[model samples]
Structure formats: C-alpha cells, structure tokens
Target: DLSSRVNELHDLLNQYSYEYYVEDNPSVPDSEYDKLLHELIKIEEEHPEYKTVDSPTVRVGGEAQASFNKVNHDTPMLSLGNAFNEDDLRKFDQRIREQIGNVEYMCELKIDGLAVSLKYVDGYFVQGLTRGDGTTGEDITENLKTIHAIPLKMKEPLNVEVRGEAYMPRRSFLRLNEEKEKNDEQLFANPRNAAAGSLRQLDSKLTAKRKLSVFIYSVNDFTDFNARSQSEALDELDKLGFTTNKNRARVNNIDGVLEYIEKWTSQRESLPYDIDGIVIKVNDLDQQDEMGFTQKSPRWAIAYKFP
Candidate 1:
C-alpha cells in the first residue's frame, strides 16, 4: 500500500509540476500539492528506496557542493551576431539569402538570463552547466535540478543536450530585492544579474529559493530527432516536456521577422520575464547548415537588440 501510494504521488505531483512549470498553468492550488508532497517526503524518509530519480521532491533543492567542476561541452555554444537597427537586419537578411538562396526566419525572444546547457541520457536529466566561454562550463547540475521548469525526465528516452536561458521571473526578482533591502543587503541591478547570481550559488537551497525558470531554445544534436526545421525542433522540445518560449514565429521573409521584433519591442515590458532582444535564425535546418558560421557567430542567426 505504501509503494502504491508513493507511485500515485509521483505521477500526480509530476503532472502538477508540468502544468505549473512547463504549461504556466496549475490545475490545483499550491496548498494541495504541498500537502501531498509532505506526505511523499515523509514516506521517502522512512523508506529511502522508494525515492526515484525523477521524484518531484527534487524541486525542494539538494545538498550543497564545496566547489564546481569545470566541464567541456560536447558541442560548443555559439553566440549570435547583433542587429541594432532595421538596416542591420536587412543586411543580415541579404547575406543569408545570398549564401543560402531563398530562406525563411525563425524569430524568438532573446531571454535576458544566463545561458546553460542541459544533458539528458535516456530521458533522465544527467547534467547541467553554465555557458562559460562557450567551450567549457562549471557544473551546476544540482542548482539546475532545483528549477521546476527543467523536467527531471523527458517524455522520450533520447540522449541529447539542449540549451536554454535560466531566468528569474520579474516578480521573483522584485521580491528578492525587496527582502534584500529589508536586510540591508546589496541590491541586484536587474533580473538577469539576479538569475545568474542565483544559479551560481554554492548552496543549491539558496538557488531553489530564488524561484528561477527556463525556456529551452535549441537542441545541440538532432541526429536522432526528426525535426527538419527550427519551428519543428521547438515543437519537439515542447512534446518532450521542455518549457519553450511561446512567442516564437516562423516568418517567410525578413519583413515578417522585423514585424515580430517590432511587436515584441513595445510589449516586452508586459511579459512576466525580461527579454533584451529578438533572436532571428534561418528556419530550415538545411539552410542554416548552408549558411554555416562566421569566426565569432552563426552566419544564419542574428540578435536584434532593442534601443
């Protein structure tokens, strides 16, 4: 009976977690989830064997590490070029069209947060690291594990490394700063800085209290995946239980990309999180390959920054 109850609690809590963290909609109240979680915690405490790898209890936080180990990324996290104005975007479009012929663009919000890489092996989250210098990153797996939005297990059993921005919601940032002010602590400059600071904490319990979230943007290797385009890749990520930005658009041309950028520029303040720019990439994966990379950034992608 205890085992069956543990199993039921796992499924129920995970579903609630998905609805709250990934879908941004919670089916049940916080009190209900908390009560069930306490029961599960008690059961797991009495019988540690009942606790599983993907348990919702992991959301509470994990033991602190004295130091983080540096990890070399399997695939380098490349940075995007910048577009400050419409003219810059047009020039970028021209270069892309010239190299890859006719192409569509995938535009998404440029989340203002720390870039992190998440590795999954056979559906279970294996590791997480910051985008330190693109090639090497400090292991922040424990801290990342506390972020509810990053699913502990995916829907599919696939080995893959996904990239995303780990961000603190604007409301969380404000509340943190308010408490900091009350305690006479140094204030964080912005939500981006607060998020980075939170994720880098040596004590994961501190990071968990920050209430950070993530929006997965790209998959490192698509060899096993069937996505032929950027939009399809996003859809696949969603189905796999990764929280992705919903404001993304696949446009037929540069003009449509600009329009999307324009719309977001004026409305970004209304969002629950902070976005510094709009990221534009070649929609088709083949076209992106054709355009290739520059010495510093991707030739097929550019970040349109707000003034």
Candidate 2:
C-alpha cells in the first residue's frame, strides 16, 4: 500500500509540475502542489529506497558539488553568424538562394542569456553542461535541476541532447539586485550576467534561490526524431514536454524574416525576458545539411542583432 501511495504521488506531482512549468497553465494551486510534495518528501525520508532520480523533490536543490567535471559534447555547439543591417540579411539570403535556390526560414527571438546543453537518457535528464569552447563543457547538472522549466522526465522516452538559453527573468533580476543593494553588495549589470553567475555557483542551493528559467531551442541530433524542418522540430520538442519559446515563426523568404526582426525590435520591451536579436535559420533540415557549417558558425543560420 505504501508503494502504491508513492507511485500515485509521483504521477500526480510530475503531471502537476508539467502543467505548471511546461504548459504555463497550472491545474492545481501552489498550496496543493506543495502539500503533495511534502507528503512525498516525508515518505521518501522514511524509506530512502523508494526515492527516484526524477522525483519532483529534486527541484528544491541538491547537495553542492566540490567542483564541476568536464564533459565533451558529441556534436559541437556552434555559434550563429551575425547580421547587423538589412544589407547583411539580404546578403545572407542571397548566399542561401545560390546554394539551395528558394528557402524558408525559421525566425526565433534570440534570448539574452547563457547557452547550455542538456542531455537526456531514456526520458530522464542525466546531465547539463555549459558551452565551454563549443567542444567541451563543465557539468552543471545539479544547478540545472533547480530550474523547474527544465523537465526532469520527458513525456516520451527518448535519448536526446537539446540546447537552450537559461535566463533570469526581468522581475527576478530586479528583485535579486534589490536584496544585494540592501546588503551593500555589488549589483549585477544585467539579467544575462545574473543568470550566468547564478549557474556557475558552487552551491546549487544558491542557484536555486535565484529563480532562473530556460527555453529550449534546438535538438543536438535529430537522427531519431520525425521532424524534417526547424519549425516541426520545435513542435516535437513541445510534445516532449520541454519549455520552448512560443514567439517563433516560419517565414517564406528574406523579406518575411526582416519583417519579423523589425517587429520584435519595437515590441521586445513588452516581453517578460530580454532578447538581444532574432535568429534566422534555414527551415528545411535537408537545406540546412546542404548549406552546412564553416570554420566557426553555421552557414544556414544567422543572428540579426539589434543596434
């Protein structure tokens, strides 16, 4: 009966968490979720054997690590080429057209935060790594677990590695600085810096207190996935229970992409988070493969930066 109770709690808590974090729509009140979580914690404390890796309790923060271990990325986290003006964007479009003729582009808001790689094995989040020189990175799994938006378990059991920007919300950044100012401590320059500093904390408990969040953008390898285009891949990620930015669009050509950039430029201030630019990528996976990469950044993608 106790085992059944534990299983029931896991299902209820994980579902509630998914609704609250991934869906951005909570079915239960905060107090109700907390009550169930406390019950689960009590049961686990009495019988440690029943504790699971993907338990909702892990979101509270874990034991601090002495030091981060280096982990190599199977596929390097490449940077995006930059576009400054309309001329730069047009040139980028011309180059793609010359190689692959017509192209559809996926335009997404470039979140102003630290980029990190997340690895999942059999639907369970196993590791999270910083983008250290694109090839190798430091393990920050414990710190990443504190972000409720990063799912501990997937809706579908799949082995995959995804990339996302972990950021501090504008409100959280303001609150954190208020506390720092009250204590007569140094203040963070921006939300991006605050988020970067929080993730690097040796004590995950400190990181957890910062109230950071993430928006998954890309999957490292889509070999097993069904999606054939960038937009579809994002849809697949959504179905897999990852928190993705909804402010994305698939544009027909360079003009549409430029329009998207222009729109976001004027309206970005209204967003809850900061976006430095607009990322434009070849929507078709085959076209992307054909365009390929250069020495540093992807040839198929370019970031239109705000002046």
Candidate 3:
C-alpha cells in the first residue's frame, strides 16, 4: 500500500540524515540521499493525500520574502543564572542536591551566538523567532530558510518549538569580514556579532550570503513527545531532524560535571565555532519542574563561564 511505502521511505531518509548530520558519518553519498528524497517528492506530488508531516520534502520550498513579522513565544525563554568558576558551579550543584536530594546533570557547550526559537507545525518549519524579550520576538522565518543546518521538514510530523543558537562559524566569519573589508563595509567584531547582524537583515538573500548555521539545544512544549529528560529530548530532536551538539555529556554528580567543564575549557577554542561557557541542566524532567523558575531564571540550571 502507499502508506507502507511512505513509512519505509521516511525511515530510510531519517537514518541517512542521522548518519550524515548527527554522527558525521555517512553511510551513503549525498547523491543517494537526494535521489531518494526526489523520488519521495515526486510520489507525494502526484498523490497529495499520501503526504505527511514527517516527509523529508518539507526541507525544501519557500522563496525569499521582504520582511519579518512578530510572534509571541508559547513559554518565556527563561534566562540562566551564572557560575563564574568551579566553586560557583559546586555550590550550584550542592544547592540543587539539597533541594532534590541528588540528581544527574547534562552539560552542553554554551554556543556563543544569537538565541532563536524555531516552530514546526505538523513537522514543517513554520516560523523562526529571535529570543527578543523572551516573551515576544521578531519572526525571521524567511531568513532562517537559508540555514542548511535547520531541517525545514522533520522525520516526524509533530508540532514543536525548539530553541537554539544561530551562529557564524569561525571560518565563515573570517571570510565574511575579509569580503567586507574589500567592499569597505564595516567588519564584524566576532562570529556572534556577525550572526546577529545577518539575521536582522530585511532581505533574506542578504542574510543567506553570510552562511549562518544553528545548534538546537532545547525543546519547548514537547510534553506530547513523551520525553523524560534533557538527554532523551536531545535524542528525540536528533530523530526528528534537528542538529544537536555532539559534545554533550550526561553525568551523575557535580565532580563529573566539573571534569567535563575542565576538559572543554582548554579545548573549546580548537572547535570550529565559539563557545562562551558550559550549560549545566538537571537531566530529569520531573526534577526540572519541581525546581521550577524564579521570576527571571530557572532554578534547575546554571551556566558556568570560562575563566
């Protein structure tokens, strides 16, 4: 039946995507992935009834638009409290444990870039927004379409809004500034600044010229997805066709978290992009809910800055 064939194709493409994007290991060449995707598009176009949210084709479509609009966030994009050093991190860890007894943590690289929210409706990227005031934001969907790292269509047609940092990689930033200098345009101070400037452009074509990319870190309003922890949500994001940082680690205690911080602190600069700090989050979803949020920040997580 058509349904069975569609399901099989979705599986094939999802696996290919995971290997290529998540693992950095490709089982098949780019041509093969494209060929299969094209075939699916052809079939779906002919039989629109068979099309579904998880189809890979959602990644395509859309033309450059002139302007962006405003969008309200489903939930406030809460700010994080800071930890300046190992001792600060220890105290934060201790404070959380005292409140909840003990908990495992997930530490992720704090990408130094623009924070944005991407919304998918029925598995298609519908809108993209800046963190703005955390309550409401400017919609930048047209510009976001050009970022290859963001999958326009998902493997599953679930309605979700994911949060991430949109950034220019170091090499891209260097090359962009070089081009700017030749043209007499002002050069960007750093990759993060460059990324912010590019996304704010009214012309999507101009935005695309900068080669911005993103690393999705948090899933907003995913209770329907049935994820139990931050790590689980990350895996689901990977399966649903979002790029997550491979360097994330799950640890049982504060010492483990510190070890991760130490390891990355010295080696972060060697990475292709910029990282300002490490984000430590309570891994358990229930624990996160119990710890709750203050008026301005989450009690369940903290950011440890590099010193």
Top TM-score hit: 1
lDDT, model 1: 0.90
Summing lDDT over every window of 10 consecutive residues in candidate 1, give the lowest-scoring window.
Answer: 59-68
- Itemize residue pairs with steric clashes in candidate 1: none
> How does residue 74 of candidate 2 score in lDDT?
64
Residues 1-307 of candidate 3 have per-residue lDDT tens digits of: 5887888888898778668755669999999999988988888989888776445665453345625667798777878999999899889888898899889999999999999998988888888899988989998887777676888788888888899999998998999999989999999999999998888877776786677778999978867676799999998888787888989999999999999998998899799999999999999999999998888899999999886
183-256: candidate 2 lDDT, tens digit per residue: 99999999999999998889888887788899999998998789999999999998888999999999999889
* Residue 261 of model 2, lDDT score: 86
- Predicted structure 3, TM vs. truth: 0.82
TM-score of 2: 0.96
Better-scoring candidate (lDDT), 2 or 3 = 2
Show where candidate 3 strays beyond 4 Å.
1-66
lDDT score, candidate 2, position 207: 86
Report, for every candidate in turn, its global Cα lDDT versus the true structure. 0.90, 0.90, 0.85
